């Protein structure tokens, strides 16, 4: 009965929310352990890291490949293909499978590097791997914000595959035929945490 | 026909097609104007109209200081309800608001905006209860994802139902509610021809 009562702080990143595993993780756990009071905090991967260090978070969903990652339990959760979101009318939705080289001279909308550090450097690298430096467009607040801006035919973007559940009119998500760098997702917690509540949560994702 | 025009809009309106459609269309007709988009909530939108940083805004009418501007109504969409897919309420064809009295509501003023947030609260009260507000702490944009996680139920503009997050469903509200309104606003007496091309493109 250890740890079936108390309070757990769960953090996750803005676009990781859209990945179906965070809502599932949370929903499963709130079933087994109704009595435990959750506390959800959505934030930057470095925010989630700092807060796990601080004691202000107990478990986080976050994108591995951050500096100092060799300080926590990092358990690989999810790997997802990255897809290009354009406007429906765009010339290139006509091509079946999209090569990123066809978007050299486009304006690439993106989140700020501080706003999404891990996703960004891999987004640029695919363009680079595709043989051009992307022209950065208008900075937008959240991953969903850029999708509506694509609907307004303002740019193309690259999003995790789980954003293709934002079915705004007038955008489409296509698949790149290059490296298709993925979006990794990892369950991260504190090394040495003997909380039972934490493992009640950590085994929920890993039964 | 030349210059820059500064356009602004609420995060939530960008799901209502009128905003992409009116931008996409103007961008076609007038490629020489450099569009500048500022996504922000209505109160700062008006602020930017006043201090001069914004020349038109898509926003929610009936705010205070709304007589210092021009506002022409653009759309009105009903507000629906998002709930987790294995909710008891999923199974009713038409749902009421009464049936959520003891329920947990997930409103975040940041995502939806004051004017919408308070009216949804008002709406519950008209049903016959004070809605028990879910998470005050660390407000995060996008409730649908906490609704997929069975943490509550939220009320969102009909536009938002294009967010087909797995594990949520959306249903219409049989209780007569207030709807989600959107105006289009510019300063009184702005005498730009570039500004007028934006308004005419929205209201042709």
Residue numbers in the entry:
A (entry chain C): 86 to 292
B (entry chain D): 89 to 292
Sentences from the paper on this structure:
The bacterial protein ItcR is unique in its ability to bind to itaconate. Structurally, ItcR is a transcriptional regulator protein with an N-terminal DNA-binding helix-turn-helix motif and a C-terminal itaconate-binding domain (IBD)24. Here, we report the development of a highly responsive, genetically encoded itaconate fluorescent biosensor, referred to as BioITA (biosensor for itaconate).
Furthermore, the crystal structure of IBD without or with itaconate binding was determined by multiple-wavelength anomalous diffraction and refined at a resolution of 3.25 and 1.48 Å, respectively. In line with the result of MALS, the IBD proteins form a homodimer in both of the apo and itaconate bound states. Notably, alignment between the structures of IBD in the apo and itaconate bound states demonstrated that monomer in each dimer exhibited translocation of over 7 and 10 Å in the N- and C-termini, respectively.
